[PDB]
A paper describes a structure:
To get a better understanding of the antitoxin function, we determined the high-resolution X-ray crystal structures of the Taq and Mtb DarG macrodomains (TaqDarG-macro and MtbDarG-macro) in a ligand-free or ADPr-bound form. TaqDarG-macro and MtbDarG-macro share the same overall structure with an RMSD (root-mean-square deviation) of 0.89 Å over 149 α-carbons and a 56.4% sequence identity. Similarly, TARG1 and apo-MtbDarG-macro display an RMSD of 1.68 Å over 128 α-carbons with a sequence identity of 23%. Importantly, we confirmed that the Mtb DarTG proteins exhibit DNA ADP-ribosyltransferase and hydrolase activities toward the same substrates as the Taq proteins. Moreover, the genetic screens in Mtb indicate that the macrodomain ortholog (Rv0060) is an essential gene in this organism, whereas the toxin component (Rv0059) is dispensable (Griffin et al., 2011, Sassetti et al., 2003). The fact that DarG is essential in Mtb (Griffin et al., 2011, Sassetti et al., 2003), combined with our data and solved structures, should facilitate efforts to design specific small-molecule inhibitors against this enzyme.
The toxin of the system (DarT) is a domain of unknown function (DUF) 4433, and the antitoxin (DarG) a macrodomain protein. We demonstrate that DarT is an enzyme that specifically modifies thymidines on single-stranded DNA in a sequence-specific manner by a nucleotide-type modification called ADP-ribosylation. We also show that this modification can be removed by DarG. The DarG macrodomain adopts a typical macrodomain fold composed of a six-stranded mixed β sheet sandwiched between four α helices and one 310-helical element.
Numbering used by the authors: -1 to 150
Write the structure that this text describes.
Amino acid sequence: GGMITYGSGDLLRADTEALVNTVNCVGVMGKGIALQFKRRYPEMFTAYEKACKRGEVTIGKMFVVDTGQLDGPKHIINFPTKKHWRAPSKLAYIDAGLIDLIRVIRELNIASVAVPPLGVGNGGLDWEDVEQRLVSAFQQLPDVDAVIYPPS
Ligand SMILES: [Cl-]
């Protein structure tokens, strides 16, 4: 059925139905993988920025956008790993987000997703901690292919 695999190279070139991006709640995708997502999906960013100004993006809730692309990823799942970008990430934010990430994958019937190392580096979390949680979460989706990208 579904496999959890070790990703490498550029997450944005993953051959999956969804891509996960790591975001803050204040409307700024200024460095790291979020910057790359902004450059590739400018309409997605504009929607995210509007939602942030209105207070609609919060810890524990995915902000999901459709790409509308005939080829490649259909959904961008923006996973909040931080409140303000000034502040670090926390394991509790990852726990809460994963709950909604699973819910969203089920609800949208996503067959495959690529996931970055949520809150590691930029957010200051330990990889091994986050990797455990990611693997645990995707074991609840036995028919989904999950490609997990370690710190690069
Ligand atoms: Cl499943």
